[PDB]
């Protein structure tokens, strides 16, 4: 059972009403104004439809993804990992509304910060110490077209293994997992640019290996207030996660 908010998702025959796919960008050059019309009109707090790319069974394998997030990253980071959520239309508003991106008079193979103004890109590119060319950010602007909406969470309720289907209550036969759609886990954000992260990102604690307060206090200053008011919850084992996640 996939729970996309309120409505359950049961059958593969009801795929089109719950899951909306977005294929290649080169194939979607025709229907691409119909994407932006749904960025403005639709209510994304009650949309109940998740956007994912179509998957090819000869390309991936789930075990290498599972050996990566559950084995190698909790060891090597010692459990300093939170689920970073992205507001996508506010990201490319920094990139495309630059001025050296928009004006075609500026040379394409020229340095960015020679021409760029006091915004967030002067402060984000001062963190990475990067001197890209004007061709480079302009290609990142093009990724806004098939770019998905707000990061969503889907709780995958499955039944347990036939050696484990003995339970005290009726819900005890079903094990569950919330998979963060279109979000990515991220380390401790740099304290020289928390102002820029406060304009783009927000934390989503959703799993035991991915709910860390020393990472999540960096992303939003209200949880930095929560950690410093009561220091019981500064551990990853102890930290409280919302009942809706």
């Amino acid at each position: 059972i996939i729970k996309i908010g309120d409505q359950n998702y049961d059958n593969p025959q009801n795929r089109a009403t719950f899951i909306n796919l977005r294929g290649r960008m080169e194939d979607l050059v025709n229907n691409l104004v119909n994407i932006y019309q749904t960025r403005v009109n639709e209510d994304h707090d009650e949309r109940h439809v998740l956007d994912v790319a179509p998957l090819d069974e000869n390309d991936y394998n789930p075990v290498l993804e599972k050996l990566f997030y559950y084995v190698l990253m909790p060891v090597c980071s010692n459990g300093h990992m939170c689920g970073m959520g992205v507001d996508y239309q506010n990201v490319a508003l920094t990139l495309t509304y630059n001025g050296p991106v928009f004006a075609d008079v500026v040379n394409a193979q020229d340095d960015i910060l020679l021409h760029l103004e006091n915004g967030t890109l002067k402060d984000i590119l001062q963190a990475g110490d990067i001197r890209p060319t004007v061709d480079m950010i302009r290609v990142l602007c093009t990724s806004f077209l098939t770019c998905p909406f707000v990061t969503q969470a889907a709780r995958v309720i499955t039944k347990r293994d036939p050696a484990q289907s003995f339970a005290t209550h009726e819900y005890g036969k079903d094990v569950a997992q919330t998979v963060l759609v279109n979000g990515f886990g991220a380390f401790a954000v740099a304290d020289r640019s928390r102002e820029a992260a406060e304009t783009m990102f927000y934390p989503v604690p959703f799993n035991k290996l991915y709910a860390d307060p020393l990472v999540a206090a960096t992303l939003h200053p209200l949880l930095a207030n929560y950690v410093t008011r009561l220091p019981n919850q500064r551990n990853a084992v102890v930290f409280n996660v919302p009942s809706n996640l």
Binding site: R24, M25, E26, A53, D59, V63, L64, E65, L67, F68, Y69, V71, L72, V75, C76, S77, N78, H80, M84, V86, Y88, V91, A92, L95, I124, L125, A127, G128, D129, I130, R131, P132, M136, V139, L140, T142, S143, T146, C147, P148, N182, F184, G185, A186, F187, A188, V189, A190, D191, R192, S193, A196, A197, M200, F201
Partner: protein, 98 residues
Amino acid sequence: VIDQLTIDVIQETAFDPAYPLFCYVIEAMIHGQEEKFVMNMPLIALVIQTYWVNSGKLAFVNSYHMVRFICTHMGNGSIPKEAHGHYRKILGELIALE
């Protein structure tokens, strides 16, 4: 395949106080896509190179799809040869586990 020296590189990035925020902006724009990464491979070869030369650490370690695409799709000398060896050893480990 992973030695203790490459865990010493991955762990130093995780405790980095000056990790760049711009490689979160790239990873949010790729969001695990085959086509959208090939368009940006002359950009991420600069974010990795200007983070391996300026400091001994390496970037784009967050998700699996960025680590997978760096090992397979370059096969070249864009990333420095020492820095590209640490990425190959990650996927050398994960295949050997399964």
